[PDB]
Amino acid sequence: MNYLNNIRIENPLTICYTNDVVKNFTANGLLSIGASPAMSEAPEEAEEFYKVAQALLINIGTLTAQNEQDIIAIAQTANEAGLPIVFDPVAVGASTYRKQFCKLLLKSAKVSVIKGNASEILALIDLDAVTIAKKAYAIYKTAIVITGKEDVIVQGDKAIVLANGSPLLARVTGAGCLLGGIIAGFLFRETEPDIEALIEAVSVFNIAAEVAAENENCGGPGTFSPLLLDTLYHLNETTYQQRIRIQEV
Amino acid sequence: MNYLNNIRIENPLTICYTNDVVKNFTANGLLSIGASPAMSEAPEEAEEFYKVAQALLINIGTLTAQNEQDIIAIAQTANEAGLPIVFDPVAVGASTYRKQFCKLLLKSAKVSVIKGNASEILALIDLDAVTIAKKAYAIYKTAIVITGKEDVIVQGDKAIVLANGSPLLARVTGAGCLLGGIIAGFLFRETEPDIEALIEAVSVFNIAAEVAAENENCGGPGTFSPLLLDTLYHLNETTYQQRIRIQEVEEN
Amino acid sequence: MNYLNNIRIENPLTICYTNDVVKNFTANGLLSIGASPAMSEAPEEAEEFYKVAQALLINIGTLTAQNEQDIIAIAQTANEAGLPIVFDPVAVGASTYRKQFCKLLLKSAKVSVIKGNASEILALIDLDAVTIAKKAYAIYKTAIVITGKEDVIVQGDKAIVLANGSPLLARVTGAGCLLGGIIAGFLFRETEPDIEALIEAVSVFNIAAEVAAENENCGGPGTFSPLLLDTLYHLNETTYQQRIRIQE
Numbered sequence: 001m002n003y004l005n006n007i008r009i010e011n012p013l014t015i016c017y018t019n020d021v022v023k024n025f026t027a028n029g030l031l032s033i034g035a036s037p038a039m040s041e042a043p044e045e046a047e048e049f050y051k052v053a054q055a056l057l058i059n060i061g062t063l064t065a066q067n068e069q070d071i072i073a074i075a076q077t078a079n080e081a082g083l084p085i086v087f088d089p090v091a092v093g094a095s096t097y098r099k100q101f102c103k104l105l106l107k108s109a110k111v112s113v114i115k116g117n118a119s120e121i122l123a124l125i126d127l128d129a130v131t132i133a134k135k136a137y138a139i140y141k142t143a144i145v146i147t148g149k150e151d152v153i154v155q156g157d158k159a160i161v162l163a164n165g166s167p168l169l170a171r172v173t174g175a176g177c178l179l180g181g182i183i184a185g186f187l188f189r190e191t192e193p194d195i196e197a198l199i200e201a202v203s204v205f206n207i208a209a210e211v212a213a214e215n216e217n218c219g220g221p222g223t224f225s226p227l228l229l230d231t232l233y234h235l236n237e238t239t240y241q242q243r244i245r246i247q248e249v
Numbered sequence: 250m251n252y253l254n255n256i257r258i259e260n261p262l263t264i265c266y267t268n269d270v271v272k273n274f275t276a277n278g279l280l281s282i283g284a285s286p287a288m289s290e291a292p293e294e295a296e297e298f299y300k301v302a303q304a305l306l307i308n309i310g311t312l313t314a315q316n317e318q319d320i321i322a323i324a325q326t327a328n329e330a331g332l333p334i335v336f337d338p339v340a341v342g343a344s345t346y347r348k349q350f351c352k353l354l355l356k357s358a359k360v361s362v363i364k365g366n367a368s369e370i371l372a373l374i375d376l377d378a379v380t381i382a383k384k385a386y387a388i389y390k391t392a393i394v395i396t397g398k399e400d401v402i403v404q405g406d407k408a409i410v411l412a413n414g415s416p417l418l419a420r421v422t423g424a425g426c427l428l429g430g431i432i433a434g435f436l437f438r439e440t441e442p443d444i445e446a447l448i449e450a451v452s453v454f455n456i457a458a459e460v461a462a463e464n465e466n467c468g469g470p471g472t473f474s475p476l477l478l479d480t481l482y483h484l485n486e487t488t489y490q491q492r493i494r495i496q497e498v499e500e501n
Numbered sequence: 502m503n504y505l506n507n508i509r510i511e512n513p514l515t516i517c518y519t520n521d522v523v524k525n526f527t528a529n530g531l532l533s534i535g536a537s538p539a540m541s542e543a544p545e546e547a548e549e550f551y552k553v554a555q556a557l558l559i560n561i562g563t564l565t566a567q568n569e570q571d572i573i574a575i576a577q578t579a580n581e582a583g584l585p586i587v588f589d590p591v592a593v594g595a596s597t598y599r600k601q602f603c604k605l606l607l608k609s610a611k612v613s614v615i616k617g618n619a620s621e622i623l624a625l626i627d628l629d630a631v632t633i634a635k636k637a638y639a640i641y642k643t644a645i646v647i648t649g650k651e652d653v654i655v656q657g658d659k660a661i662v663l664a665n666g667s668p669l670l671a672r673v674t675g676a677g678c679l680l681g682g683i684i685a686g687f688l689f690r691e692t693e694p695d696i697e698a699l700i701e702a703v704s705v706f707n708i709a710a711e712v713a714a715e716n717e718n719c720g721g722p723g724t725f726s727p728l729l730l731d732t733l734y735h736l737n738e739t740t741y742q743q744r745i746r747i748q749e
């Protein structure tokens with residue numbers, strides 16, 4: 001825990017353009033680790049907000065025509081402002097609508113992290129999550145995080161596999177959508193983030209999940225979600241170091 | 250608990266076009282019973298989503314001009330794909346805006362379940378809940394579920410009255426809006442669902458509400474809502490069978 | 502606890518045009534105190550709804566071009582109907598977009614309460630929270646509530662400072678955005694509310710927060726949120742009277 005300490009003290013302004021199902025949970029997750037979430041969606045204020053922000057999350061979970069042109073416009077505003085973009089191509093494999101939009105976005109702007117599941121990342125570039133992540137990294141030259149049973153991170157010349165979390169995370173809507181926001185909270189305006197910042201963001205989230213699911217008062221997916229926020233708020237270096245399970249490839 | 254066991258194993262894709270106050274809760278409810286919710290609202294992807302989905306929920310709780318034309322278009326796309334629609338005419342009796350919209354929708358598309366309170370269903374058709382449900386069934390030839398102190402379901406040649414749930418359920422926003430999603434999770438792509446699927450859906454919800462409200466850790470409407478999700482996640486056959494209360498059944 | 506008793510019995514219909522991060526939490530907080538929330542955003546039903554409503558909340562937390570004209574239109578419809586408006590100029594200091602919009606809104610319609618933090622209310626008008634609140638009152642001739650470490654209320658010829666609540670509230674998104682909706686719930690269709698109603702609304706919220714944070718089962722910001730809703734639901738006169746901390 002190096003980056004988390006800085007999030008708690010500096011309260012980084014983390015702009016979220018995310019889906020309607022997960023806005024509240026995203027904002028709450030960010031507040032629990034000390035970040036300052038802002039769900040600004042008006043392109044008319046992007047320039048002034050982005051000047052002082054630390055990152056931008058773009059998540060297309062509920063993409064519609066109302067969002068398309070605005071997302072492209074704000075991504076260009078972010079690039080111009082040097083504001084790092086975390087991009088979550090939610091369910092891109094499920095429609096030609098989403099595929100065509102994600103291709104247009106990644107042809108129009110440079111993003112700093114692409115986060116998804118194996119199937120989503122595979123649809124972007126078209127078996128192993130590591131192989132998929134490496135192929136995507138070669139195409140976009142942008143950090144890749146593939147979430148799954150084990151999580152994969154590829155940045156620069158390094159690929160890492162992480163093994164933390166809980167099954168109850170799959171049964172909470174926008175767990176993974178919140179993870180995209182947490183990653184944005186760890187960037188501190190670095191458009192080419194150190195792999196160590198990405199490893200800490202994913203590990204903080206998954207170790208908090210693991211600890212929450214062990215709490216005596218966790219009785220299922222409903223009670224888990226408040227206990228995850230509490231555990232993120234309290235997470236300390238001892239717990240982190242005892243629990244982290246990482247290995248290189 | 251025949252259908253709930255199948256939801257947990259098959260993980261049915263359940264598309265929800267629902268109101269902004271209850272999206273998250275609705276998705277979490279569906280996940281807790283094993284379904285796979287998707288809040289897709291773009292008509293441009295409805296054809297590809299609906300081919301593989303098991304039902305669609307349409308709920309007009311926060312209806313605005315931005316939604317009107319899109320709802321009509323996706324209902325038609327559902328009808329063309331054979332995808333069952335669960336329609337929740339939220340607060341239809343409260344404005345001419347909502348009345349006119351709901352009338353237009355039901356003239357444009359065939360829905361598979363209409364779910365509402367007695368006042369909502371009465372406003373649609375222009376009396377006890379059973380009489381209102383039967384009149385609505387005669388007009389739309391579509392399953393009707395009327396929620397209330399007792400719940401009423403009319404489908405095919407039967408009318409049933411059910412008696413489960415909790416007072417805390419009225420103090421949680423989108424409890425009922427979640428019920429419309431749960432129902433959609435029980436349809437398995439049947440455009441004329443068996444009444445037994447509707448009975449199980451309403452009973453699973455109300456029994457889970459009852460048991461959550463009895464939990465020692467339930468301290469009010471705030472702690473109830475996480476407990477309801479847990480109870481839906483854990484609900485078993487023994488608890489279902491011990492608790493279910495059918496009040497009366499009429500045939501034909 | 503005069504007004505809260507009446508909310509529980511009368512179940513006032515409280516229209517909320519609020520931001521997409523806090524809609525569910527706002528509706529739940531209102532339901533917990535006995536109010537009847539309705540998140541109606543269609544100008545086409547504003548006239549019928551507002552006739553029977555007790556107040557309207559306007560909160561610009563996620564303001565976009567899709568909202569601008571509609572907000573102006575429904576604020577005018579509220580004025581015509583005699584429906585009191587609570588206005589929360591969320592982050593107004595953060596962009597010229599929001600500054601321009603809030604200026605236009607307050608030139609187009611008369612609101613009944615303006616609620617914000619000190620930096621928001623200062624950006625609206627252009628040292629301490631009391632001074633800012635008095636200057637805003639002199640400009641808009643409208644009750645002002647400034648939230649902070651201590652809360653400030655200015656209405657008519659009185660200014661009050663309150664000292665209740667919990668740090669945990671700042672770590673729960675739309676706590677403050679809920680307070681706007683709770684204030685609306687205490688208006689009972691009074692376009693010039695008594696300062697006592699505003700003091701009660703803010704005190705109920707803050708005392709509930711303080712009691713929730715002391716619960717043995719409150720383990721942080723995540724468990725706090727459900728416990729705040731429970732504590733609003735159960736809050737009684739005895740606890741209110743024991744806990745209230747008011748001055749000037």
Ligand SMILES: Cc1ncsc1CCO
Binds near residue numbers: 027038520522562
């Ligand atoms: C976090 C956030 N972003 C826009 S609105 C909102 C809730 C607090 O005002």
Ligand SMILES: Cc1ncsc1CCO
Binds near residue numbers: 173
């Ligand atoms: C359930 C759902 N539907 C669109 S976005 C979302 C949350 C998980 O991505």
Ligand SMILES: Cc1ncsc1CCO
Binds near residue numbers: 426541
């Ligand atoms: C409180 C509320 N307002 C609009 S929709 C909704 C939930 C179901 O009416």
Ligand SMILES: [Mg+2]
Binds near residue numbers: 091
């Ligand atoms: Mg994803």
Ligand SMILES: [Mg+2]
Binds near residue numbers: 337339364366369425
């Ligand atoms: Mg209904």
Ligand SMILES: [Mg+2]
Binds near residue numbers: 589590677
């Ligand atoms: Mg404010």
